[PDB]
């Protein structure tokens, strides 16, 4: 029976591979929690102990919603002076950080490094995506398809080709926020043409940080999307087509994928 004596302490990566941050390294109750660059070595204003009581702490103070309405900011507050329930948090194995009482979820709503965080409604945005802890670097790897086959990336779309570790086009960076990005132009993200049973995954701007750009490497062996509840699938199990499509789970060989890191 796995004990829970343990209380680890990690930094938190997220939108665009940035870090969760205590503004300027200042802690006065009320100070906004921002989304800065992931600093070179491990500083305090970027580290977070994930305590048993379900609170999240830097330098002993608490990660705190200002209030329970979608669009209110998270700040640093001394946890005892702070409103009890406004300081509890819950991190899901699916990569979202929810606040129980509010039902709202932590999200990074602007591009800028200097961005503030907010509780939002849960739409499973790439921007509502998070991934603890310490090594924030995106995960550089090759995604393998069927037998003999890997995702290759040509400008805007992507299809499958013969797995070759030499080719750069077959190399992807998966970011703490759940985006998949070609190590060539890390400003692209794999995206759904639309939220349809049919699209046809394209490459688009992560400027947007939408729900349709956040992917899960799920342990049934599918590449899953928690907003669409659909996975990445290889058209009619015919790869000559140069098309990969969002489709519901069957579990057939065509839907299965491997991280070949």
């Amino acid at each position: 029976i796995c004990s829970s004596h343990y209380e680890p302490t990690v930094r938190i990566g997220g939108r665009d591979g940035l870090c969760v941050d205590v503004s300027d390294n200042a802690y006065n109750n009320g100070n906004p929690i921002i989304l800065w660059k992931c600093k070179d070595q491990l500083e305090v204003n970027q580290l977070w102990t994930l305590k048993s009581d379900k609170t999240i702490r830097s330098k002993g103070k608490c990660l705190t919603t200002y209030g329970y309405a979608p669009g209110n900011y998270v700040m640093i507050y001394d946890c005892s002076s702070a409103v009890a329930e406004a300081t509890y948090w819950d991190i899901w194995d699916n990569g979202t950080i929810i606040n129980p009482k509010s039902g709202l979820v932590l999200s990074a709503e602007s591009s800028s490094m200097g961005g503030t965080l907010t509780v939002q409604k849960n739409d499973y945005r790439m921007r509502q995506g998070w991934r603890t802890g310490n090594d924030t670097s995106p995960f550089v790897t090759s995604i393998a398809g069927f037998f003999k086959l890997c995702m290759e990336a040509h400008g805007n779309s992507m299809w499958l080709d013969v797995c070759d570790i030499t080719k750069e086009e077959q190399q992807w960076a998966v970011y703490p926020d759940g985006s998949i990005r070609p190590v060539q132009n890390t400003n692209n993200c794999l995206t759904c043409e639309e939220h349809k049973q049919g699209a046809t995954i394209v490459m688009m701007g992560c400027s947007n940080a939408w729900a349709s750009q956040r992917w899960v490497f799920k342990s049934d062996g599918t590449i899953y999307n928690l907003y669409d509840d659909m996975v990445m699938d290889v058209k009619s199990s015919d790869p000559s087509l140069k098309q990969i499509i969002l489709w519901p789970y069957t579990g057939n060989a065509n839907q299965m994928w491997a991280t070949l890191f």
């Binding site: 029976i1 796995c2 004990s3 829970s4 343990y6 680890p8 990690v10 994930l50 819950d90 991190i91 899901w92 194995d93 699916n94 990569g95 998070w130 991934r131 603890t132 802890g133 310490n134 090594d135 995960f139 550089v140 790897t141 393998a144 069927f146 037998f147 003999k148 797995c163 570790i165 998966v174 490497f217 799920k218 342990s219 049934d220 062996g221 060989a253 491997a258 991280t259 070949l260 890191f261």
Partner: protein, 247 residues
């Protein structure tokens, strides 16, 4: 008893069907949507082992003794003779390949001992189909060349037991088949092999979707990937966890 890969008529399709069906048998429960093995304190000794048959022709086939535990490979039977590793316990011997003549190999069944015996590191020894069919053929025509018996055992374990554990090893295999060219394991594979226990335990102690100790893997270009989260892509490489605790 009959969980068997026919290596004659192997396809990527064929080989998978097998590994699956094996993971299946090994699969004791699910933890956080990952197949964990059984609690060795939930299994009785006479129930503890599994038999996989690898056939070459038909004629021509050897069985393996798989601990249900690990998932480890305690032994292999080649006809009317069977052979056990020098560290299988008394149970493997009494409850497995009975009705046969039972000998003990002079080596442990970890790698750093098999490697010792093969005079060759894990990473110089090539994997593929033809190499596994060469293995079945060899082990079957019972020729006592320990040096080889090690080498060819290393091939099998990997392409079977390690295949069972890491979705990463299944593909590498499946890629060989479709490619028809042999491969040696890269830094990435060796990691997963060498880090199954500690990664297994991580997944299971996970609390805020966070590992209480950082598991550190190596990627093809010998860089460190340091994994502290259940939410990590890599974690997906794991298809079978050794049981360490219930949450």
């Amino acid at each position: 008893d009959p969980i068997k890969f026919t290596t004659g008529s192997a396809t990527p399709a064929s080989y998978n069907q097998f590994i699956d069906a094996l993971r299946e048998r090994l699969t004791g429960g699910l933890i956080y949507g990952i197949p964990v093995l059984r609690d060795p304190s939930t299994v009785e000794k006479p129930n503890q082992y599994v038999t996989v048959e690898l056939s070459y022709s038909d004629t021509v086939s050897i069985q393996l003794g798989i601990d249900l535990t690990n998932a480890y490979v305690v032994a292999y039977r080649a006809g009317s003779e069977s052979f056990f590793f020098r560290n299988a316990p008394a149970s493997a011997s009494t409850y497995l390949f009975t009705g046969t003549q039972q000998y003990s190999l002079p080596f442990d069944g970890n790698y750093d001992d098999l490697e010792k015996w093969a005079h060759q590191s894990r990473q110089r020894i090539s994997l593929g189909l033809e190499a596994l069919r060469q293995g079945i053929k060899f082990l079957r025509s019972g020729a006592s060349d320990d040096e080889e018996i090690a080498r060819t055992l290393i091939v099998i374990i990997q392409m079977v037991a390690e295949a069972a554990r890491f979705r990463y090893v299944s593909k590498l295999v499946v890629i060989s088949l479709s490619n028809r060219a042999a491969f040696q394991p890269d830094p990435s594979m060796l990691s997963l092999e060498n880090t199954w226990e500690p990664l297994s335990r991580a997944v299971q102690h996970t609390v805020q979707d966070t590992f209480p100790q950082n598991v550190t893997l190596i990627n093809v270009r010998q860089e460190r990937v340091v994994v502290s989260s259940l939410s990590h892509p890599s974690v997906s490489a794991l298809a079978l966890m050794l049981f360490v605790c219930n949450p």
